[PDB]
Design a protein around this ligand. Structure first.
Ligand SMILES: [Fe+3]
Ligand SMILES: [Fe+3]
Length: 182
């Protein structure tokens, strides 16, 4: 009800993501989230970008943890799942669209570059996401948040560092609450 309890629910979600399978990645899902948010904040990005980075893979676990969907590597349309969850909590359409686009961003870059820059897990999930963008690249390039999405995606591919200390979920509590009141 209050933004503080709303945020407490998300922080609780995030904290729980820690104890979940790695879904084919080198570090846990909580760690992955925290790294992207770090790279985003330390880079000067705005709070909406930082929040989108932190929460971009929420959909792998917020409504189900059916990792078998993408052959063990994640939940079906996790980008849309997480995006809709946050729209539900009251997040900006901007955050939501950035999250929803992080998969399109992958599909784009792969058609326009990079498949080697992909983790083993990410390459594999592409074949449950519509594969390489064909035409599609035009619509995606015609997105207002086009560069933004690519940015999110950049941090996404970076947030896989083994043995890296980064601020925990609580570091982001004030940031989420403000976003909500806004
Ligand atoms: Fe993802
Ligand atoms: Fe990710």
């Amino acid at each position: 009800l209050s933004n503080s309890s709303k945020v407490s629910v998300l922080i609780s979600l995030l904290e729980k993501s820690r104890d979940l399978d790695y879904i084919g990645e080198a570090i846990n899902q909580l760690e992955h989230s925290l790294q992207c948010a770090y790279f985003a904040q330390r880079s000067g990005a705005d709070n909406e970008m930082v929040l989108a980075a932190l929460l971009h893979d929420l959909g792998h676990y917020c409504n189900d943890t059916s990792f078998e969907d993408m052959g063990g590597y994640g939940v079906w349309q996790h980008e849309k799942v997480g995006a809709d969850y946050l729209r539900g909590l009251g997040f900006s359409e901007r955050v939501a669209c950035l999250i929803e686009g992080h998969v399109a961003a992958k599909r784009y870059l792969v058609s326009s570059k990079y498949l080697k820059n992909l983790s083993d897990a990410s390459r594999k999930t592409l074949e449950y996401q519509g594969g390489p963008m064909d035409g599609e690249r035009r619509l995606f390039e015609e997105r207002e948040d086009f560069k933004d999405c690519l940015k999110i995606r950049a941090w996404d591919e970076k947030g896989k560092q083994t043995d890296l200390k980064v601020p925990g979920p609580e570091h982001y509590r004030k940031m989420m609450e403000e976003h909500l009141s806004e």
